[PDB]
């Protein structure tokens, strides 16, 4: 039971029109907070805001392609650019959330050491490392798997694969059992390990707070904030990776599952600032 | 001390106000705040 194209287009437009003002307001608030004083959490907030803005910029092409006659209503020259702009933020947000959870765990379980090592330079360096690693992984996978690479067929187009007729969007009509292991490895290394790190840091912070003698209200507020962030990350990223691993396990997957996964991933840009916007 | 404070010479308030007004108007030109200063020779700009 695939969703009608009109409903998909409408929900994409609504999601973009709600996310964009919230995203720009969150970015403005983060910049205003950083102007007075710079904090390690503010760096992650600014990075998340930039990723959300990039995702909103990439949204309209997907929104207009979601129609029935929307196989590829755009030039193919910038198709890899759109694919990167749509794929990078999904893992970038998870990486930023994992880094923030690690920082919170370090500041809670090891307060003296964290205070002695309070340096925004370390946060900027780790953010740059995450950006570089994700970009390098995406580029290597695009070269190895997508057509036009060294291991790809010579008689092919970069991001275009229409063996029958027409012209589809990048990764919209990917050939089954072609980049299955590559997509599975990307999903693992970009979400499952960050998810495990985030869960470990969350449970460690909760244990440290329980062992702490702080006020019950402060502990409850911190636990609620951490749980809300974890629930946001789950409900925004997990379904897409689950669909990817289900497709990798056996090629029987096909139909509206990919559309639902993409819609859930697009809901991230509109749902994340609600719990982490620093308004 | 209060007796010494009481035995002092006091002048009219109007004369003192007139003197203060004359002092304020005499140095109005010399004050760089009442009259804006050009940036050509301003040390701070």
């Amino acid at each position: 039971m695939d969703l009608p194209p009109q409903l998909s287009f409408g929900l994409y437009v609504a999601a973009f029109a709600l996310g964009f003002p919230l995203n720009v307001l969150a970015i403005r608030g983060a910049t205003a907070h950083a102007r007075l004083r710079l904090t390690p959490s503010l760096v992650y907030a600014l990075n998340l805001g930039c990723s959300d803005l990039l995702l909103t910029v990439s949204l309209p092409l997907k929104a207009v392609e979601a129609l029935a006659s929307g196989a590829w209503p755009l030039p193919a020259s910038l198709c890899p650019v759109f694919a990167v702009a749509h794929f990078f933020p999904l893992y970038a947000g998870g990486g930023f959330l994992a880094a923030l959870s690690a920082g919170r765990y370090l500041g809670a379980a090891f307060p003296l050491g964290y205070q002695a090592f309070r340096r925004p330079c370390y946060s900027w360096g780790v953010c740059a490392a995450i950006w570089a690693l994700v970009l390098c992984h995406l580029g290597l996978v695009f070269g190895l798997e997508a057509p036009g690479g060294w291991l790809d067929h010579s008689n092919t187009s970069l991001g275009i694969n229409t063996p029958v007729n027409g012209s589809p969007v990048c990764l919209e009509a990917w050939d089954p059992a072609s980049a299955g292991p590559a997509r599975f490895s990307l999903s693992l290394l970009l979400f499952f390990l960050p998810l495990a790190i985030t869960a470990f840091c969350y449970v460690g912070c909760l244990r440290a707070l329980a062992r702490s003698g702080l006020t019950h209200r402060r502990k409850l507020r911190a636990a609620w904030v951490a749980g809300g962030a974890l629930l946001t990350l789950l409900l925004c990223v997990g379904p897409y990776n689950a669909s990817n691993v289900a497709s990798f396990l056996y090629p029987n997957l096909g139909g509206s599952w990919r559309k639902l996964g993409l819609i859930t991933g697009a809901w991230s840009v509109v749902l994340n600032p609600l719990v982490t916007g620093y308004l | 001390q209060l007796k010494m404070e009481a035995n002092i010479d006091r002048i009219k308030v109007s004369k003192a106000a007139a003197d203060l007004m004359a002092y304020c108007e005499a140095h109005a030109k010399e004050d760089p705040l009442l009259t804006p200063v050009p940036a050509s020779e301003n040390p701070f700009r």
């Binding site: 907030a45 964290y114 002695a116 440290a208 | -």
Partner: protein
Amino acid sequence: TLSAEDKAAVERSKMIDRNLREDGEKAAREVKLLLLGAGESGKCTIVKQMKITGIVETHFTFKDLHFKMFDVTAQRSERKKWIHCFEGVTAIIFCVALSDYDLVLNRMHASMKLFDSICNNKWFTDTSIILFLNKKDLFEEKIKKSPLTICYPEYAGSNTYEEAAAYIQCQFEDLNKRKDTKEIYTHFTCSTDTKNVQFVFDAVTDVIIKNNLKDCGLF
């Protein structure tokens, strides 16, 4: 900066700025505590235990952590004029003489009034406060000898040490209106040296954890 004098001035300014940055980095991780008391409690017994004008400065390091304690017993002036200077301190150490309830300057009432005044200050809302009750043995001897009803006519019950100490602690703790964002670490002073410094270190660690959580955004 064509002139040599201008270059020298710029270099001196850069050196001064780097020295300021180094000093700020050094002082960022340094922990300061404030010592307060009413009447004879201004001269706290912690410094005397360690041994055996204006602000008195004391330095001691526990568990590789530097602690600074300031004594304000010599500042016999208006408290509100200079109370805003002691802002951003890690914690405030309050010492109450439990054996001063019988003595009249009334001493316990004055201590409670001063505690209420300092706890309700607009500049001390974020700062945590540590409550120390001294002379527990003297207090128990006094209540065994003299009745406690004189100090608290409303209070009724037996004259044992445990319930009297609990009642005093509750009456001291319930003196703050903001019970959500303010925490009080009440304690009883004992002859053991390790217990007091351990409690102070635990309170400082809790304050540091709260500050780190606030910085990370969990507040």
